[PDB]
């Protein structure tokens, strides 16, 4: 009750700065305001009263409690309308849009650049009720923006990084709303907001369209490059198997198998010529100098190419695991031939190591076939899980027992690694010549050998049960999604082209006239087709088609 | 039936990858051998004896180097251990998601 | 369910009869307040009930769980540490770690007032462990 | 859970001190007046904060707080 007489005392005093438009001053709640409290206390009536007294509907709460990454902080953007949107109060939003005094504008941005839709994406994490609330609020706010302002398209407004809510929705790993945005159909009063159509439905077969305005890699900074080279969430492999992405990636992958096979064959020819040069190292000097020039140009080519890749798209281990090996291998080969032309007498182990590393690095191209593609993904999952920590523990055991045997040995067991070789050759079954007889006690070394054997058996058995534990409690529909993601990475890399050859890449999808805009000209979009078979079509009514005759 | 299912699922991938490993390491060892490692067949025989446990290893010590040879043999044994573990866990993943009616 | 019902109602009746007595503070012959006995014997659900217990307005002081402030979806809850903190000798944590004998000692540590507390102490004393 | 338990035993043993130095420990948590006790004085207790997030708060009800202003 006292508020309107208190505001009346504020008005009748003749204040130059009014009381209701006043900000908190601390660092923690910087720029907080009365209207945010009125909204958060679930009161429609006090919001109405404060709007009648002249409250600022653009009070930017830019404080330290309103940042994303501080502990126990609530991010909603800074706008009051954003707060009423996030807190699921519909009529408050409707009053803030349709009040007669100081109307709200959806095009307004926070100090961080986010509008109401961006922050509404930011607050959705995971549930049934959270995702249903977020999707319903999103669609209702789009319809209200459509009836409020026909001027601008609201989803076109970018962030400070340059993101529309689709792109940022994929970047932050929000999946359910992202699925909802990629397949979204509205009704007849405003159908021009939708993205999905039906071209024709001839009984149980139907052809759906999808718009690709920011999904195709022809446009700069697409959702594809954001999923591949910018998304850090561990749920990216669920974000690839969606409906209008799968048809596009299948079409592009079957469109550009032959460049993949061609580059694979050229790399095989490279390694065969390198094999001949490494075997006939030892007239024939013409072929040897041709081998010098050929391996030099190939190593220069691949070293510069992977250096250019490492410079282009990097901003962290297993995803980028493949390219690092080729970069190191090409550096090793070019350094080996550089020291060889320098004649530095170090070039033979570098040459043999480069040959080994190059033939081991051929398993990059096992991703074309699924039967070895799943196998290579399992190799990477072995490489991430147990190998590093297990090798560290094994080095602890090895170094301890080797120094023990060295200090026990007073002409076998001469040095540290010269006995560490005996200790490792003992684990596979080539250990020999016990009872060294240079000291009285050899049962010491007997018990050391028993201890080392039993503990290494324990460690291998622990690595086995760790691999079984990590592999059994994971869905079978995971490695296939990882394979589809890795194919997506590779096909976008090949669509980028060569580094010495900038390709004139092409648009995908058919351009057609999807409908009419509410302002004049007909809406024409680029679209991707997808067929579908549904035997439950006779329960529901038939949807609105574009062309009746199936083309 | 499980013999046929295992040979059908493992051979045409695993022996191919393992063959790439053996051939690369054998050509590397013959190259790094400047009477041990006499021919390519004997070198592949030695490198498979290390998979049986009969390979006789020593320092080269008047050659290119010795520890390079040693570290390459280390890498061979550890990577084949990796691949055998991979074949095991793939067969266990195929065994885990199965039904008791199917083999019958 | 019957135990938490009888326990809360019996504490309310003890509040209504004699206010000067503090009933959850009386030790046994082993020297144990009943929360500590519930921790030592390895009884789970009643212990979880006692650690987070809230009551209505006529008896506020019996309750242990307090809300500092609630602002929309985020909330700040206060827990009491009258017998939980290891500052005093013979705390509940000291009973769990050392003096107990139950086979479910790992199950009781993931509870609400212990989890963030051990989180805070461990992150406060990482560097001397590394030292 | 077993990892949490072993970490708990370790952090308690390191909090106790080593053998040649028994150290006066530190209390943890915030001390404040929570409410009023029915016998005279207000309730004065030590507290620990936990900040938690939940989305069913609208259809459910809000309870009474200790401080109206968040701080
Ligand atoms: C980056 C890692 C993880 C790595 C880099 C080098 C040092 C490597 O040693 C390791 C550690 C190691 C050593 C010995 C046995 C197992 C693991 O394994 C690979 C790495 C282990 C081998 C085999 O590589 C693989 O794991 C398979 C593989 C290669 C390339 C791929 O794109 C790939 O994905 C499909 C899989 C290649 C080496 O370069 C090789 O043959 C020599 C000379 C050293 C090997 O480190």
From TrEMBL, chain B:
It is found in: Cell membrane. The chain crosses the membrane at residues 11-32, 63-84. It comes from the Eukaryota. This is Transient receptor potential cation channel subfamily V member 2. The gene is TRPV2.
Automatic annotation (TrEMBL), chain C:
ANK repeats lie at residues 30-53. It is found in: Cell membrane. Signal peptide: none annotated. It comes from the Eukaryota. This is Transient receptor potential cation channel subfamily V member 2. The lineage of its organism: Eukaryota, Metazoa, Chordata, Craniata, Vertebrata. The chain holds residues 318 to 448 of 817 of the full protein.
From TrEMBL, chain D:
It is found in: Cell membrane. This is Transient receptor potential cation channel subfamily V member 2. It comes from Oryctolagus cuniculus (Rabbit). The chain holds residues 711 to 781 of 817 of the full protein.
